[PDB]
Structures are given as structure tokens and as C-alpha cells.
Design a protein around this nucleic acid. Structure first.
Lengths: 100, 55, 120, 112, 96, 68
RNA sequence: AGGAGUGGAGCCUGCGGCUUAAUUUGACUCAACACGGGAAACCUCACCCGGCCCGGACACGGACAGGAUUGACAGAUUGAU
RNA sequence: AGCGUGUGCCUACCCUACGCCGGCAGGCGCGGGUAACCCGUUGAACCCCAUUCGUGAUGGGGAUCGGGGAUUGCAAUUAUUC
């Protein structure tokens, strides 16, 4: 059973914390764990005017969001990796499970 | 024929088919990534969405 | 004394033909308009408009029928008909000559007045 | 939308913040306030009402949404609760200088 | 109002079984998202409980597009002696 | 606002008093009769009545028009 | 010291003025004038000519199951079944 | 080459490789992508090379205007667009 788990979040430091904890857990559980594949991050750029009406110097904002996505690959049966993945999930980090 | 001529006008497409989902106005809509509001409401509620003006 | 001819066919020849070849007798936009769909969704007004046109006064000046539809393409069957179409304020009562074919009722009712400037 | 929701109801309760935590096939919404006894109402009526309206509004499954109401520590350090306290002080009718001096001094001995 | 008798009592036992009400503010919604089994728009629903507000039995506050009607104890009494129910059936907002 | 144009009014409906006795007619014997025709439609069934006009026959809610 | 220009030519857009039944309106030095995120065929629409419905709650007095009211097809009508 | 974007709640309206037809604007059955996977190695333009032009309101400049054909939409006329 080849299994893929995706660690997609908005904040990056809690993402590094949970990915390091998952890699450490797969290391201590005597399991063949692959390295964390770092996908190219996606920048959310939409610009708008400052003032609500139409007068003033034409000044704009640059609002930004960065979403980071990570990949961890394992070779393990289903129930043990469910038991691993259902431990200590952050509210700002979303995990999703896929099977090949 | 009040029932059949009250709103027989097709608002299938066009600008008035969509509206702001915060304050229901039809000017300056942002449709990108499905926000579906005007610019003022997005600027007022932009912090809880998570958009920061870092750049 | 001159006899009118449209696209090589005569007036009664135009009357006694149908839409299935009349679309190719029309231009590009009018073929697209008549081939778009049935005149039922909004053009039940057009259906009853040709019905009210098919109402026949006797051998005199035919009675004028007026409508708000400015998007009506002149069929060959309604030549020699008296109609006033709404430009927004009044009805411009116009005589349908045997030349109208290929146009709209909005071609023959002006909206803006012709401007005549005075002193700035 | 949930933030503007809970500050529309919980203005008199002294609202401070919201937290959403995700669980498999379960939604957790944590309500931060200061009047943790008035937020429940009598026998938990109003928090059940809020659970029902958020479940019916947001298309949520039946029996998967629950609301936990925990009061916030260090009441003088959250600026939103002091803002609603000043709003309800000025709404009842009182001098604005006395109320602003009172909230300023309360924030000052509160540890800021 | 030109409302049928069935629609008024329909919103009534929907409100009596569960004492909460959510509706998006638009007049051209042909069927309710909850009452799609029968034929009733939202305009009937908002005008009926606006009449219920004016007779003084429910509360109200407004979101972006969503109304929020809440039930009162005298509202429970009014729905009880209007829908003609024995007083042992309770709305789910009180009983846990 | 009163204008130069004359004011139009809605239908003030004419009031009829006890028209149900004009549906059936009673004789001096023991029988019940139907003066007008009954609509044979399924949902527009055996309860409602149907008109008697100078040229046509028309029902109330099912809208089936009959003429000679 | 220079470079690219604008202002002159045709066109797009905006503003003033003129006409119109309406040519909706805010803004007039920097800090109004491809500004209102305003690239308007319908909606937008707030301007003009026309016609429907109440979506006038709640309370009082008439009204009233012997009827408080709603909906509609022969044919004229405006514009429309 | 590089920033990007992509099947949306009431809300239906996405980005597109590939085959045929047609000068072209375009049309039909076919496959992928809910995205570092598919468009895509984004065969972009200015530039580079080789002919034609030769100081002429000229093969510069494309305003104005006539006729015809497709697409979007319930509807284009005061030409939507091509």
C-alpha cells in the first residue's frame, strides 16, 4: 500500500513543526519515509484602491497570501497511518490523505 | 398576467445577475477567486480572511 | 412605371416563399436572427403582431397598428402596411414601402431631435 | 461571517474572539467571551439556538456542530471587550470624560 | 396577504418543532431551501414573521443576507394555542 | 397627486345574493336536478359549477372553454 | 547638462457648453478632468414617456359564512395572451 | 522569457492539446486539469538573415465609407465584436 499525505497550510512555521513531527514519528516507527518535497509556493495578489470614493492620489494596496504545500510518502497499511495522522493537528494546518 | 409579467425578464447573464454578498451593491465587484463583493467590504474585512498588505 | 426586384425575385414571389429559404435570401445578421430559435420566449408579441397585421381592413387605407417592438424585421408579407413604432415619446406613423426588406422598425423612427445650436 | 455573527449577538456579553478548529467529520467552534454564564442562558437555550442557526445557515450536517464557550483570561488586555464596555457605558447615558478616564485607568492597572 | 392557510401553518410547525429560522433575503426565490417539498417563496416567509414581529412574539437580527428570528416563551404559548397541541410536546431549543 | 388626466378606478364588483339556488332547480316532487353542465375534468371534478354565457361555456379554475 | 515627450495631424476616453421631453449626478490648482475601480445594447439606473402589484406591518370601528376576497378565457383597448 | 489564471453557493458563465471541414472569422464528435502532472519546454514580440520597394502624400499613414460572412446574447439599429 503506497500512501501519500499532503500538508497544506497558510502559516509556515506551524507547517514546519507538524512536518518535522510527522517525519520524526515515521522515523521512530521504523518506516521507510521519503523526504519532504517542497512545492513552489503560490502568491495571492489582488490590488485595489485605498479610498472608498473616487478622489485622491491614485494609491493602491498589495494584499498577499502565501500557501505552502508539502508531500510525504510512506509504504504502510491503512489503520496505522490513520492512527499516526489523527494526532495533534493544528487549526491552521490542513492535512489530507490520498492512496495510490 | 401579473404573475407571468412580473419578473419574466431574464437575469441569466449580465452585471445584475451577481451582487455583493456583504452589502448587496452592484458597483466595483471583485469576482476573482470567488470573493464576490465590492472593494470597500474586502478592504474592511480583509484581516480576518488572512490577506496581509506585506508588499 | 419601374418594377421593383429584390435579389432577382418579384414581390409576389417573395410573399409565396417560406422562411427556410428566406434566411438565405436575407443577410448574415437576419439569417442568424431567424435561425436562432422559435418566436415564443419573448416574441409571442411578434406572433400576435403578425396576427394583428393579418387582420384585414377593407379596400381603403389600412388601419394603423402600433407597437413598442423596435426589433421587428420586415417580412415580405407586410408590405403596404401602416404602422407607428415607439421611439420613447410618441409614435411615428410610417408607410411601409416595398423597400423595407432587410431592416428594423428602429431604422425608421428617430429618437434624438436634429440639433440646431444657438449661442454658447 | 462567524466573527460578525458572534459580535452581533454577544455585544452585551462582552465579546472578544473566535476560534475554529477542524476535526474529521466534526466542526468545533470555540467562543471567547467574559460573561460565561450569560452566554449559555437559562439551561443552555441560547447556545443551542446559535448552534441550530449556524447549522441551518451553513449547510452543516445534523449532530456534527457544537459550541464551547470559554471565558478569556486577563479581561483588561483585550481591546474589543473594553470597547464594548465603553459602548454600553455611553449607551446608558453618562459623561464621556468620566467613562474614558475609567476605561483608561482600568487598562492601566490591568497590566498593560 | 394572499397567503394560503397551509403555508402559514407550515412555517408554524416548522418553527414549533425547532424554534430557529434562517432565510436569505431575496424576493425571487421560488421554493425555500428547507421547504422544497411544497410551494412557498421566501417573501411569504419574511412578511409572515414580520407580521409576527409586529404582533410581538419573535426577535430579529440581520447578517449580510441572512435573517435570524428567535423564539420567545410567549411565542411558544402562542404557537401552542394556535396549532392546538397538547402541552407535553416541547420545542427542541429547551429540552436537551 | 391630482393631474389633468381623469382618474381610473378598479372593479367595484357587483354583489349577487343567494346564487346557489340558481344552480339547482326544485320541483313539487321528490327529485334533484342539474340546470347547468358539469365539468368532466379530474381535479376540476364534481364540486364546482360552470357558466352559461351567450356564446360559450367556461368553468372557474380549470379553464376549459366550450362553444357551439 | 541632457534623453523621451505633451501641446500641431486623425482617432479613443473624460470635462465644460449647446440642443433635447431626459441628454442623471459627485469632483474644478497642486490635492477635479482612462476619477468614482464608471470598458452604460437589457440589469446596472439613480433621467424621461407609459402600465400593472403591494411587498401599507400592528392596533380601533364598520364589513361579514345568507359571503370578507382572489384568480380568468369569446371580442375593443394601451403594450403585452 | 517571466509574473500569472483555470470547471464558481443562489450562479447557469472555466483553461485547453488532438482529428476533420472552410481563404478566414468559425463549426461537430472526440481527451486532460479542479492544477510543478493538462494547455506548456507557455516555439511571444522587438531583434537576426534573405528578396521586393527607391524620396514620389510613395508599397508611409489607415481616418471616413460601401457590400458580404461568422460568434456572444431574449434582443445589435445609434454599425457589441471578429
Amino acid at each position: 500500500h503506497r500512501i501519500r499525505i499532503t500538508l497544506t497550510s497558510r502559516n509556515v512555521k506551524s507547517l514546519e513543526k507538524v512536518c518535522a513531527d510527522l517525519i520524526r514519528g515515521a522515523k521512530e516507527k521504523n518506516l521507510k519515509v521519503k523526504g519532504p518535497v517542497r512545492m513552489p509556493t503560490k502568491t495571492l495578489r489582488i490590488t485595489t484602491r485605498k479610498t472608498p470614493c473616487g478622489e485622491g492620489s491614485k494609491t493602491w494596496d498589495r494584499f498577499q497570501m502565501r500557501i505552502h504545500k508539502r508531500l510525504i510518502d510512506l509504504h504502510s497499511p491503512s489503520e496505522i497511518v490513520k492512527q499516526i495522522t489523527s494526532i495533534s493537528i493544528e487549526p491552521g494546518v490542513e492535512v489530507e490523505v490520498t492512496i495510490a | 398576467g401579473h404573475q407571468q409579467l412580473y419578473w419574466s425578464h431574464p437575469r441569466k447573464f449580465g452585471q445584475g445577475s451577481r451582487s455583493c454578498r456583504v452589502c448587496s451593491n452592484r458597483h466595483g465587484l471583485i469576482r476573482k477567486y470567488g470573493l464576490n463583493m465590492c472593494r470597500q467590504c474586502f478592504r474592511q474585512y480583509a484581516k480576518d480572511i488572512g490577506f496581509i498588505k506585506l508588499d | 412605371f419601374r418594377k421593383f426586384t429584390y435579389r432577382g425575385v418579384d414581390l409576389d414571389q417573395l410573399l409565396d416563399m417560406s422562411y427556410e429559404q428566406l434566411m438565405q435570401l436575407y443577410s448574415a445578421r437576419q439569417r442568424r436572427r431567424l435561425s436562432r430559435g422559435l418566436r415564443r420566449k419573448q416574441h409571442s408579441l411578434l406572433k400576435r403582431l403578425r396576427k394583428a397585421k393579418k387582420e384585414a381592413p377593407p379596400m381603403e387605407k389600412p388601419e394603423v397598428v402600433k407597437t413598442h417592438l423596435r426589433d421587428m424585421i420586415i417580412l415580405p408579407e407586410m408590405v403596404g402596411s401602416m404602422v407607428g413604432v415607439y421611439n420613447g415619446k410618441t409614435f411615428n406613423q410610417v408607410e411601409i414601402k416595398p423597400e423595407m426588406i432587410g431592416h428594423y422598425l428602429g431604422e425608421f423612427s428617430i429618437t434624438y431631435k436634429p440639433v440646431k445650436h444657438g449661442r454658447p | 461571517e462567524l466573527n460578525e455573527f458572534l459580535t452581533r449577538e454577544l455585544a452585551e456579553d462582552g465579546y472578544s474572539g473566535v476560534e475554529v478548529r477542524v476535526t474529521p467529520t466534526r466542526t468545533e467552534i470555540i467562543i471567547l467571551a467574559t460573561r460565561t454564564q450569560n452566554v449559555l442562558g437559562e439551561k443552555g437555550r441560547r447556545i443551542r439556538e446559535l448552534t441550530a442557526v449556524v447549522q441551518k445557515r451553513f449547510g452543516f450536517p445534523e449532530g456534527s456542530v457544537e459550541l464551547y464557550a470559554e471565558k478569556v483570561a486577563t479581561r483588561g488586555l483585550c481591546a474589543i471587550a473594553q470597547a464594548e464596555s465603553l459602548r454600553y457605558k455611553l449607551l446608558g447615558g453618562l459623561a464621556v470624560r468620566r467613562a474614558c478616564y475609567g476605561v483608561l485607568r482600568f487598562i492601566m492597572e490591568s497590566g498593560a | 396577504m394572499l397567503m394560503p392557510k397551509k403555508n402559514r401553518i407550515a412555517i408554524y410547525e416548522l418553527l414549533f418543532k425547532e424554534g430557529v429560522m434562517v432565510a436569505k433575503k431575496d424576493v425571487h426565490m421560488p421554493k425555500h431551501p428547507e421547504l422544497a417539498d411544497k410551494n412557498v417563496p421566501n417573501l411569504h416567509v419574511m412578511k409572515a414573521m414580520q407580521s409576527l414581529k409586529s404582533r410581538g412574539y419573535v426577535k430579529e437580527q440581520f447578517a449580510w443576507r441572512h435573517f435570524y428570528w428567535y423564539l420567545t416563551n410567549e411565542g411558544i404559548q402562542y404557537l401552542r394555542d394556535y396549532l392546538h397541541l397538547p402541552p407535553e410536546i416541547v420545542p427542541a431549543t429547551l429540552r436537551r | 397627486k391630482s393631474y389633468t388626466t381623469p382618474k381610473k378606478n378598479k372593479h367595484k364588483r357587483k354583489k349577487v345574493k343567494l346564487a346557489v339556488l340558481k344552480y339547482y332547480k326544485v320541483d313539487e316532487n321528490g327529485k334533484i336536478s342539474r340546470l347547468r353542465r358539469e365539468c368532466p375534468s379530474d381535479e376540476c371534478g364534481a364540486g364546482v359549477f360552470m357558466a352559461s354565457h351567450f356564446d360559450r361555456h367556461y368553468c372557474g379554475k380549470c379553464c376549459l372553454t366550450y362553444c357551439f
